[PDB]
Ligand binder design. Structure first.
Ligand SMILES: OC[C@@]1(O)OC[C@@H](O)[C@@H](O)[C@@H]1O
Ligand SMILES: OC[C@@]1(O)OC[C@@H](O)[C@@H](O)[C@@H]1O
Ligand SMILES: OC[C@@]1(O)OC[C@@H](O)[C@@H](O)[C@@H]1O
Ligand SMILES: OC[C@@]1(O)OC[C@@H](O)[C@@H](O)[C@@H]1O
Ligand SMILES: OC[C@@]1(O)OC[C@@H](O)[C@@H](O)[C@@H]1O
Ligand SMILES: OC[C@@]1(O)OC[C@@H](O)[C@@H](O)[C@@H]1O
Lengths: 90, 90, 90
């Protein structure tokens, strides 16, 4: 057991986002070609996965953050992180 | 220790697949723009990773499912999950 | 607890890289359409994530390798693995 990370990237700069679960929280580090900085994403969790896709120039990110009990999807669509509709079962 | 997830996405709808290892099995939840539903993928495992790529409009998915002893590659190529040639060592 | 893997792919062959953390080390298995073989990447770690992007025909890979204490970014840009600038905090 260590930290656990997830990564996604887009474009040809590129932009990179690295999510790290450690000590009960998932945080986000960002690269847009100018140096690493801390992103806005911050949620509880012990495990994280991520995927992203471009629509034209606009990035859309989905982070699947899992605590001990619940996987919550968090959505970046250019204007803040929002709770997604994802559920693990119907 | 929690559930562990992996995610992939494709297209501009987009389609998303989220694989979750929990309680000894890896299951799959799917988004094609119309709501989340449970996919056909179901294999034993404690850890999962995934990658996918498009060939034209056709998606190809590779899921790396790891039990306590073995990582098995599972392949989606439009017509069922099949065992892949992946091995961890030669 | 098992092995832990991460995967990335590119192109339409495709090429695939699967990173496996097991027994203290992260190793790499490669598919370029001709069979699986062992890649050059080998670093200590218990957890791994990966992302990659193409610039034209040239692949660029970023592997985030985490030991018990440190996440190190490793960079493939066509001519060897190099230590990346990534840090988890500023
Ligand atoms: O410009 C940085 C930022 O807005 O990029 C998109 C997301 O990664 C956000 O969490 C992050 O703060
Ligand atoms: O709100 C954005 C959303 O619709 O984007 C597609 C999927 O990620 C959904 O779970 C999510 O709710
Ligand atoms: O349409 C759903 C489905 O066929 O999509 C491709 C794969 O994700 C399958 O496991 C899944 O059942
Ligand atoms: O059968 C499909 C296959 O050839 O696709 C490419 C790689 O994923 C291989 O391991 C796999 O066997
Ligand atoms: O041709 C194989 C190789 O050079 O491909 C790029 C990287 O995955 C390297 O670690 C790997 O040895
Ligand atoms: O050296 C290559 C590099 O600049 O590529 C972009 C990011 O992965 C950086 O952390 C990294 O140092």
């Amino acid at each position: 057991s260590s930290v656990q990370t997830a990564a996604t990237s887009w474009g040809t700069v590129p932009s990179i986002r690295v999510y790290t679960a450690n000590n009960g929280r998932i945080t986000e580090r960002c690269w847009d070609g100018r140096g690493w900085y801390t992103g806005a994403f911050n949620r509880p969790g012990r495990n994280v996965s991520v995927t992203s896709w471009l629509v034209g120039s606009a990035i859309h990110i989905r982070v699947y953050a899992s605590t001990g009990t619940t996987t919550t999807e968090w959505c970046w669509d250019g204007n803040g992180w929002t709770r997604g509709a994802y559920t693990a079962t119907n």
